[PDB]
């Protein structure tokens, strides 16, 4: 039974996420909807570097540094950390898998936190410029 | 009501997709079912072109070319057309959307129509070589 969002939708909107955790022995279903609520939000910030790589891939890229694949995923922790504002909008728990779901929405990121996340990985101040300004888009973008 | 593959699921099988097309005027819902089959066999060629973005993004990418997003975008065509043994698993009409989604699955892919498909688009014969080989890890990895 219900709810729509739960539904395969595949449009984007990169600042919302789904994703889940299962029912585990040690543990009251408020820690695992937690625990999903928190792998949502990972998957919001999955999604944006995700677009950051198309950008960076792009013939107009304006990146001059070498940023690898294994850099990108190591800019998901910061992305997360600069996360502001991040609704949890609906839990959905599979009876059949005991599978909880989680709807999570970014509202906003603070801007001088994820430049600071990402020059501390090692990110020249071009790169830094282009990446948080991409990720400003995005968020305007919604 | 119902079904298991229409909830957001998340793990990838990179080979399978779910897309959809809506109940339009002009139209019997064969057509739509139809539509919306073929946008899903479209999502798993981006499934694997999306895979191959972050193979030639990683510090191990042998590919010695350029390429770009767009080109990528690109490549959408030729693997789609390279897709072999596409089996529609399922069909699901949102009564709400009037939506109807599909489930399919690629169980292989031409590897020689591949390679020609990417050769015509101006790829090295390194790149489709490398590009090739990594959908071949693709297939396999199911």
């Given at each position: 039974d219900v709810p729509y969002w739960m539904l395969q939708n595949r449009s984007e909107y990169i600042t919302q996420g789904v994703d889940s955790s299962h029912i585990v022995d040690?543990?009251?279903?408020?820690?695992?909807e937690k625990?999903?609520?928190?792998?949502?939000?990972?998957?919001?910030?999955?999604?944006?570097?995700?677009?950051?790589?198309?950008?960076?891939?792009?013939?107009?890229?304006?990146?001059?540094?070498?940023i690898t694949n294994e850099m990108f995923i190591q800019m998901t922790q910061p992305i997360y950390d600069s996360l502001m504002n991040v609704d949890r909008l609906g839990i959905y728990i599979n009876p059949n898998n005991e599978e909880v779901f989680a709807l999570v929405?970014?509202?906003?990121?603070?801007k001088d936190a994820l430049s600071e996340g990402l020059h501390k990985m090692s990110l020249d101040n071009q790169a830094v410029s282009i990446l948080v300004a991409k990720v400003e888009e995005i968020f305007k973008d919604s």
């Open positions: 040690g543990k009251k279903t408020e820690e695992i625990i999903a609520t928190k792998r949502a939000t990972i998957r919001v910030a999955q999604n944006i570097v995700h677009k950051l790589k198309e950008a960076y891939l792009s013939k107009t890229n304006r990146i001059k540094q070498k929405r970014a509202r906003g990121f603070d």
